[PDB]
Design an enzyme around this catalytic site. Structure first.
Site, PDB file in Angstrom:
ATOM      1  N   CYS A  81       0.758  -1.246   0.000  1.00 28.70           N
ATOM      2  CA  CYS A  81       0.000   0.000   0.000  1.00 28.70           C
ATOM      3  C   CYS A  81       0.791   1.301   0.000  1.00 28.70           C
ATOM      4  O   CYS A  81       0.596   2.138  -0.873  1.00 28.70           O
ATOM      5  CB  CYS A  81      -0.951  -0.037   1.190  1.00 28.70           C
ATOM      6  N   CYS A  86      -1.790   1.045  -2.996  1.00 27.98           N
ATOM      7  CA  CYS A  86      -2.766   2.111  -2.822  1.00 27.98           C
ATOM      8  C   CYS A  86      -2.219   3.496  -3.069  1.00 27.98           C
ATOM      9  O   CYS A  86      -2.555   4.142  -4.056  1.00 27.98           O
ATOM     10  CB  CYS A  86      -3.293   2.159  -1.402  1.00 27.98           C
TER      11      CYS A  86
HETATM   12  C1  LIG Z   1      -1.971  -0.823  -7.433  1.00 30.52           C
HETATM   13  C2  LIG Z   1      -2.779  -1.245  -6.191  1.00 30.52           C
HETATM   14  C3  LIG Z   1      -3.655  -0.318  -5.577  1.00 30.52           C
HETATM   15  C4  LIG Z   1      -4.435  -0.610  -4.436  1.00 30.52           C
HETATM   16  N1  LIG Z   1      -5.291   0.376  -3.890  1.00 30.52           N
HETATM   17  C5  LIG Z   1      -6.054   0.009  -2.730  1.00 30.52           C
HETATM   18  C6  LIG Z   1      -6.876   0.980  -2.219  1.00 30.52           C
HETATM   19  O1  LIG Z   1      -7.006   2.167  -2.697  1.00 30.52           O
HETATM   20  N2  LIG Z   1      -7.623   0.592  -1.068  1.00 30.52           N
HETATM   21  C7  LIG Z   1      -7.576  -0.648  -0.447  1.00 30.52           C
HETATM   22  O2  LIG Z   1      -8.287  -0.855   0.567  1.00 30.52           O
HETATM   23  N3  LIG Z   1      -6.731  -1.620  -0.981  1.00 30.52           N
HETATM   24  C8  LIG Z   1      -5.989  -1.277  -2.109  1.00 30.52           C
HETATM   25  N4  LIG Z   1      -5.148  -2.233  -2.651  1.00 30.52           N
HETATM   26  C9  LIG Z   1      -5.015  -3.532  -2.085  1.00 30.52           C
HETATM   27  C10 LIG Z   1      -4.265  -3.529  -0.807  1.00 30.52           C
HETATM   28  O3  LIG Z   1      -2.967  -2.956  -1.172  1.00 30.52           O
HETATM   29  C11 LIG Z   1      -3.991  -4.878  -0.204  1.00 30.52           C
HETATM   30  O4  LIG Z   1      -5.193  -5.661   0.003  1.00 30.52           O
HETATM   31  C12 LIG Z   1      -3.341  -4.882   1.173  1.00 30.52           C
HETATM   32  O5  LIG Z   1      -2.109  -4.085   1.054  1.00 30.52           O
HETATM   33  C13 LIG Z   1      -2.937  -6.217   1.598  1.00 30.52           C
HETATM   34  O6  LIG Z   1      -2.341  -6.196   2.873  1.00 30.52           O
HETATM   35  P1  LIG Z   1      -1.662  -7.461   3.397  1.00 30.52           P
HETATM   36  O7  LIG Z   1      -1.182  -7.178   4.748  1.00 30.52           O
HETATM   37  O8  LIG Z   1      -2.529  -8.652   3.175  1.00 30.52           O
HETATM   38  O9  LIG Z   1      -0.462  -7.453   2.375  1.00 30.52           O
HETATM   39  P2  LIG Z   1       0.704  -6.389   2.137  1.00 30.52           P
HETATM   40  O10 LIG Z   1       0.266  -5.077   2.738  1.00 30.52           O
HETATM   41  O11 LIG Z   1       0.954  -6.387   0.662  1.00 30.52           O
HETATM   42  O12 LIG Z   1       2.005  -6.818   2.942  1.00 30.52           O
HETATM   43  C14 LIG Z   1       2.573  -8.142   2.909  1.00 30.52           C
HETATM   44  C15 LIG Z   1       3.810  -8.056   3.774  1.00 30.52           C
HETATM   45  O13 LIG Z   1       4.505  -9.340   3.880  1.00 30.52           O
HETATM   46  C16 LIG Z   1       5.889  -9.165   3.579  1.00 30.52           C
HETATM   47  N5  LIG Z   1       6.376 -10.355   2.975  1.00 30.52           N
HETATM   48  C17 LIG Z   1       5.973 -11.036   1.795  1.00 30.52           C
HETATM   49  N6  LIG Z   1       6.670 -12.125   1.551  1.00 30.52           N
HETATM   50  C18 LIG Z   1       7.602 -12.209   2.608  1.00 30.52           C
HETATM   51  C19 LIG Z   1       8.636 -13.138   2.943  1.00 30.52           C
HETATM   52  N7  LIG Z   1       8.904 -14.218   2.193  1.00 30.52           N
HETATM   53  N8  LIG Z   1       9.391 -12.904   4.104  1.00 30.52           N
HETATM   54  C20 LIG Z   1       9.141 -11.820   4.885  1.00 30.52           C
HETATM   55  N9  LIG Z   1       8.134 -10.847   4.626  1.00 30.52           N
HETATM   56  C21 LIG Z   1       7.426 -11.188   3.417  1.00 30.52           C
HETATM   57  C22 LIG Z   1       5.938  -7.923   2.723  1.00 30.52           C
HETATM   58  O14 LIG Z   1       7.261  -7.482   2.637  1.00 30.52           O
HETATM   59  C23 LIG Z   1       4.906  -7.047   3.290  1.00 30.52           C
HETATM   60  O15 LIG Z   1       5.338  -6.258   4.406  1.00 30.52           O
HETATM   61  C24 LIG Z   1      -4.302  -1.962  -3.871  1.00 30.52           C
HETATM   62  C25 LIG Z   1      -3.428  -2.896  -4.490  1.00 30.52           C
HETATM   63  C26 LIG Z   1      -2.686  -2.554  -5.618  1.00 30.52           C
HETATM   64  C27 LIG Z   1      -1.786  -3.641  -6.182  1.00 30.52           C
END
Ligand SMILES: Cc1cc2nc3c(=O)[nH]c(=O)nc-3n(C[C@H](O)[C@H](O)[C@H](O)COP(=O)(O)OP(=O)(O)OC[C@H]3O[C@@H](n4cnc5c(N)ncnc54)[C@H](O)[C@@H]3O)c2cc1C
Ligand SMILES: Cc1cc2nc3c(=O)[nH]c(=O)nc-3n(C[C@H](O)[C@H](O)[C@H](O)COP(=O)(O)OP(=O)(O)OC[C@H]3O[C@@H](n4cnc5c(N)ncnc54)[C@H](O)[C@@H]3O)c2cc1C
EC number: 1.8.1.5
Lengths: 522, 522
Positions: A81, A86
Site C-alpha cells: 500500500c 494504494c
Molecule cells: C496498485 C494497487 C492499488 C491498491 N489500492 C487500494 C486501495 O485504494 N484501497 C484498499 O483498501 N486496498 C488497495 N489495494 C489492495 C491492498 O494494497 C492490499 O489488500 C493490502 O495491502 C494487503 O495487505 P496485506 O497485509 O494482506 O499485504 P501487504 O500489505 O501487501 O504486505 C505483505 C507483507 O509481507 C511481507 N512479505 C511477503 N513475503 C515475505 C517473505 N517471504 N518474508 C518476509 N516478509 C514477506 C511484505 O514485505 C509485506 O510487508 C491496492 C493494491 C494494488 C496492487
C-alpha cells in the site's frame, strides 16, 4: 549483516533516511533486528509479514497484553500500500482527475493548452519515490517506541515449522503463527514479458529509468489496470487496454459501468475486450518495441516502448502451503475458516493471502481479528456486503446490488438516480457537487457532471444498493454501507441532514420519493 | 403581462431559454401562470416562495394528495442555491481549490507558472450565468409535467391575509399558508456601501460588468465571506478580510479552526479581527475606490475597485410579520414552534425565514415537515446536532463537539487525530487521500496534506465530535453524523470497513485505539 536496533531509538527522519539507504544498498542492506531480549514470555504469535495485516495484527495483539514478533523482507512495516500499492496509485489517480480537467478546459481560464502536451510519468513516480519513505520511518519509529512492537525487517522469514520461524540467523518459537505475506503482482506467460519496457504496479516505482513514449499498452480490465490506465491516458499517451474478458466487471450496475466506460473511451482510451497478448517484440538492445495480441477480430500489432501489466495479485502461498502443508483454493489462496485458521492448527492466514476481497480493510480486520482469536477470543470473520471503489479519471464507488442484479434476486425494485430522465440525457448540469462543478457548467461538458444511482426495494422500501461516479463519495460509502446494512429504508434515508451540494444526492431524493404512496417513478 | 402556461408543455430547453429571456427582459418579463383550473378542491396550502423550502414542500404535499400553489418573484423554482447561493459558491470553491494547487506547484509538472498571474473572476462568474438556467428549466419542466405541481412564477406574492393570497392579478384562498420566502443578503449601513464596486453573494452574479483589480476587500468572518474570500485570493489578488469579531467561529474545535486560518494566512489572505468598515470612497464616476475601516490597532485605508460583502443573510420577515402580525426574534426570524407553526394559525414559516441553521437541509426538511403537518400529521422538527461544512481552499467538515467544547461540557475526553504527534508536526505526508496526495508528497507542502480530529469520551467511549480539513469528507459526515447520533463507540467505529486512503482515517485509527485498555494516548 545484522543490526541490533533494539537500543538505538532513531528519529522518524533517521528512520526515513536509514530506510532509503537499506532500500538502495546494492547487497540488500543490513537486517533490522528489534526484539525485546528481556521478556520471558513466549511469542503468542509471530507474524510472517509486517504489512497491512501483519503490522495491524501485531499492534492489536500487543495491546491485548500478548507478545508478538514481525518479520519482513522489506526494511519497513506497512506492506504494499505505502510503497507500491494504494498510495502511489492514488497519486496517479489524483493526476488522472486533474489532467482530465486541465485537458477538458485546455487554454481556457487558468488552464494551459494541453494540445500536444504529454506529461512526464517518470517525473511524478519520481516524486513518489522521493517521499514514500517518510511515512515508513514514521511507521517504524511509531511501532518500536510507542507500540513497543517487536520485529525484524529487511530479512526474509524462514517458517521452519508450525511453532518455529527463523530470521537474522536466529531461531524463534511461538504458541501461534499468523501468515500475513499477502500477494505478489500478477504476470503474463508470453515471450518478451521481461523486455525492459514492461511494467507492473510494483516494478513501476523502482525501474522507471526512462520516460515512456507516445503510446502505452495496459493489460487487464479491473481496478489497478483501469487506474494506472486512466493515468497514462491522462499523461496524453494513446492508451490501449487489452482485456482477456470484459472490463470493470466489478461495477455490477450496468448503467453505472457503462457511463464509466464511455467516459474512458471519450478520453481516447481504447479498450479491447477478449484480447490475449500474443507476444512482446524487443530491440537489439532488449527493450519493448511493440505488442502483438489476439482479439476476437483478428490479431493486431501495436508499437510502444512501454507496457504496464495490470493483472490480479497472486497470493504468495505456494512455498508456505508446502512447508506447513496448508489447504489452497483454485487461485492459490490459503484456505481459512471463519476464524482465519488454516488447515494446520495454531496457524492463521490473513492478508491478500486468503484471496478476495484484496483490500486494506480486509487485511487490517483479518490481521486484527486473527490476533484477537489467538488471545483466546472466538471471533469469526467473513467479509461480505462491503463498500467498494476504483479510479479512472473519476471516483467510482459502489455497494450492494446493481440494478439488474436486484431483479435477478427476485426483488421488485425502483431506482432513484442522477442526472434525471430528460430529453437532454446526461447533457445537464446535473448531478453537481465539489470537483464536478466546472464539468457541469462548461460548454458541452455537462455529461461529465458525473453519474449516480440507488437501488430500492418496492414494498419493504429497503435500500439494496448505491452507485456513484464523480468525487467525494468514496468516504461516504464506508458509512452509508453500515447504515444500509442496518436496514435503511428510502424513508429513513430521506430523513437525514444532507450537506448540499452533496456528491451523493440520495438523502433529498429519498425524502421526496418516499413521500409518494408508491415508490415507482424512475 | 400574464402568460397562462397551463397548457403549453414547453421543453426543458424551451424553459431554460424562456427563463433567460424573462430574466433579462427590461420590464421584468411576463408572469408564468400555471394553475390547474379544473380542480375543485381548495388549496391545502399556498407556499409563499418556491425555492428550497417551497419547491420541496410543494412536491411532498402534492405527493400526499393535497393541492398546493407556489408563488414567486423569480421565473423559476429552486431559490437562491441554484441562482446565486450554493451552486455558484461551489463553482468558486472548486476554482479556489484548483488554484491553490496550481499555485503551490507553479511551473512544476503540468502546472503553468502562476507568478504574476491573476485569473479572471468575471470570466468564471460569466460561465456560471451561462448555464445556471439549465437546472431552472429542468426544475420548472419537471415540476409542472411530472409532479403536476401548481405555481406562478415571476410575480411577487401578495399575502392579503391568513387564508388568502393574490398573484397574477387574481385572488386565491387556501386552508393554510406556508411562508418560505427565505433570507436576503446582509448589508452594511455605511457611506458608499452602494458604490458600483461593492458586491454581495447575490449581486455578484448579476452586476459584475468588469474585471476586479489587484486587490479585494471582503467584509465578514463566517461561511460565504471566507468562501468567496479564498476564491478571490485564489485568483491571485491581495485579499483583506475585515471581521467585526472573529473569523470562522463556526469551527468550534480550536486546533481545527487554527489549522484552517494558518492555511489561509499562508495564501496571502489578510484577516482583520474586530474590524468595522468606516466608509467606502468612490470615484468622480461613482465606483468604489478605497475602503476605510477601524481596527483594534487604529484606522486603516485600503485601495480597491472591488468589495465583497459577506455578512449573514437576513430573514425576509419584515413585511409579512406586518401583514399576518407574526412573532419575530432578535434577528428578524419568524418564530415557529416545533411544528413550523407561527404565532398566526394556519400559517407556517420554513426557510432561512426561521433563522438558523440557514442550510438547504433545514429549508428542505422544514419545508417538507410543515407540508406534512398541514395534511394532518403531527411531526415536530427542531434542528439540532447536524453535520456542517464550509470552504476556503480546503473543505472543512465538522459535527458535534469540538475538543475544548467537550471538556466544558464535563466530558473527560481523549482525541485521535491526523497528522500524529511527532517532531515533524504537520510537515509529514500525513494525513493523505484523494486530492491531497501532491501536497503530501510535494517539497515542503506536506503541512498541506490536511488536518482531522475526532473527540471521544473516556468511559463510555461514545463519539462526541468529528473534524476534518481536506477534501472528500463532506459527504461522509452526512452519514457519519447519523451513526454518531445513534451512539457510536470508538469500538463500533474501528469495526467498520474503510476505503484507504480515506479522506477521514477515523475507522482504522479507532480500531487500533479501541484495542488499548485505556483510550488515553493522544
Ligand atoms: C496498485 C494497487 C492499488 C491498491 N489500492 C487500494 C486501495 O485504494 N484501497 C484498499 O483498501 N486496498 C488497495 N489495494 C489492495 C491492498 O494494497 C492490499 O489488500 C493490502 O495491502 C494487503 O495487505 P496485506 O497485509 O494482506 O499485504 P501487504 O500489505 O501487501 O504486505 C505483505 C507483507 O509481507 C511481507 N512479505 C511477503 N513475503 C515475505 C517473505 N517471504 N518474508 C518476509 N516478509 C514477506 C511484505 O514485505 C509485506 O510487508 C491496492 C493494491 C494494488 C496492487
Ligand atoms: C452565498 C451563499 C451560499 C450558500 N451555500 C449553501 C450551501 O452550500 N449549502 C446549504 O445547505 N445552504 C447554503 N446556503 C443557504 C441556503 O441558500 C438557504 O438556507 C436556502 O436557500 C433557503 O431556502 P428558503 O426556501 O428558505 O429560501 P430561498 O431558497 O432563498 O427562496 C425564497 C423564495 O421566496 C421568493 N420570494 C421572496 N420574497 C418574495 C415575495 N415578496 N414575493 C414572492 N416570492 C418572494 C424567492 O424569490 C425565492 O423563490 C447559502 C447561502 C448563501 C447566501
Amino acid at each position: 549483516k545484522v543490526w541490533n536496533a533494539r537500543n538505538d531509538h532513531l528519529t522518524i527522519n533517521q528512520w526515513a533516511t536509514r530506510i532509503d539507504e537499506i532500500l538502495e544498498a546494492p547487497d540488500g542492506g543490513e537486517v533490522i533486528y528489534n526484539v525485546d531480549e528481556n521478556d520471558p514470555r513466549e511469542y503468542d504469535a509471530i507474524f510472517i509479514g509486517g504489512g497491512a495485516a501483519g503490522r495491524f495484527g501485531s499492534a492489536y495483539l500487543r495491546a491485548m497484553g500478548g507478545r508478538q514478533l514481525i518479520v519482513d523482507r522489506w526494511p519497513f512495516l506497512g506492506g504494499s500500500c505505502p510503497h507500491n500499492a494504494c498510495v502511489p496509485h492514488h497519486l496517479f489517480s489524483d493526476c488522472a482527475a486533474e489532467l482530465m480537467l486541465a485537458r477538458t478546459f485546455s487554454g481556457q481560464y487558468w488552464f494551459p493548452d494541453m494540445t500536444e502536451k504529454v506529461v512526464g510519468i517518470k517525473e511524478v513516480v519520481d516524486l513518489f519515490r522521493a517521499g514514500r519513505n517518510g511515512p515508513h520511518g514514521i511507521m517504524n519509529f511509531q511501532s518500536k517506541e510507542q507500540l513497543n512492537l517487536e520485529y525484524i525487517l529487511n530479512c526474509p522469514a524462514k517458517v521452519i515449522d508450525n511453532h518455529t520461524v527463523e530470521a537474522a540467523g536466529k531461531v524463534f518459537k511461538a504458541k501461534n503463527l499468523i501468515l500475513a505475506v499477502g500477494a505478489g503482482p500478477g504476470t503474463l506467460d508470453v515471450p518478451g514479458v521481461n523486455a525492459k519496457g514492461v511494467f507492473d504496479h510494483a516494478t513501476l516505482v523502482e525501474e522507471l529509468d526512462y520516460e515512456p513514449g507516445s503510446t502505452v499498452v495496459v493489460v487487464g480490465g479491473s481496478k489497478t489496470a483501469v487506474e494506472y490506465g486512466c493515468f497514462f491516458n491522462a499523461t496524453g499517451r494513446r492508451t490501449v487496454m487489452l482485456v482477456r474478458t470484459e472490463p470493470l466487471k466489478l461495477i455490477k450496475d450496468n448503467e453505472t459501468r457503462a457511463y464509466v466506460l464511455d467516459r474512458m473511451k471519450e478520453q481516447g482510451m481504447e479498450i479491447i475486450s477478449g484480447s490475449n497478448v500474443t507476444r512482446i517484440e524487443e530491440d537489439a538492445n532488449g527493450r519493448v518495441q511493440a505488442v502483438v495480441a489476439m482479439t476476437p477480430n483478428g490479431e493486431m500489432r501495436i508499437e510502444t516502448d512501454f507496457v504496464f501489466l495490470g493483472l490480479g495479485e497472486q497470493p504468495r502461498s505456494a512455498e508456505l502451503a508446502k512447508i506447513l502443508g496448508l489447504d489452497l483454493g483454485p487461485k492459490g489462496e490459503v484456505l481459512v475458516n471463519e476464524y482465519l485458521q488454516t488447515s494446520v492448527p495454531n496457524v492463521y492466514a490473513v492478508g491478500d493471502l486468503i484471496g478476495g476481497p484484496m483490500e486494506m480493510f480486509k487485511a487490517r480486520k483479518s490481521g486484527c481479528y486473527a490476533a484477537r482469536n489467538v488471545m483466546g477470543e472466538k471471533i469469526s470473520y467473513t467479509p461480505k456486503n462491503y463498500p467498494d471503489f476504483l479510479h479512472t479519471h473519476y471516483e467510482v464507488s459502489f455497494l450492494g446490488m446493481g440494478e439488474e442484479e436486484a431483479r435477478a434476486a427476485g426483488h421488485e425494485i425502483v431506482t432513484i438516480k442522477m442526472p434525471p430522465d430528460t430529453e437532454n440525457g446526461l447533457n445537464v448540469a446535473l448531478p453537481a457537487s465539489d470537483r464536478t462543478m466546472l464539468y457541469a457548467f462548461g460548454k458541452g461538458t455537462a455529461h461529465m457532471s458525473g453519474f449516480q444511482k440507488i437501488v430500492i426495494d418496492a414494498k419493504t422500501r429497503k435500500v439494496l444498493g448505491a452507485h456513484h461516479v464523480g468525487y467525494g463519495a468514496k468516504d461516504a460509502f464506508q458509512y452509508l454501507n453500515v447504515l444500509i446494512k442496518q436496514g435503511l429504508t428510502v424513508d429513513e434515508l430521506g430523513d437525514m441532514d444532507e450537506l448540499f451540494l452533496n456528491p451523493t444526492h440520495f438523502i433529498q431524493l429519498s425524502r421526496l420519493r418516499a413521500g409518494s404512496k408508491n415508490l415507482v417513478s424512475l
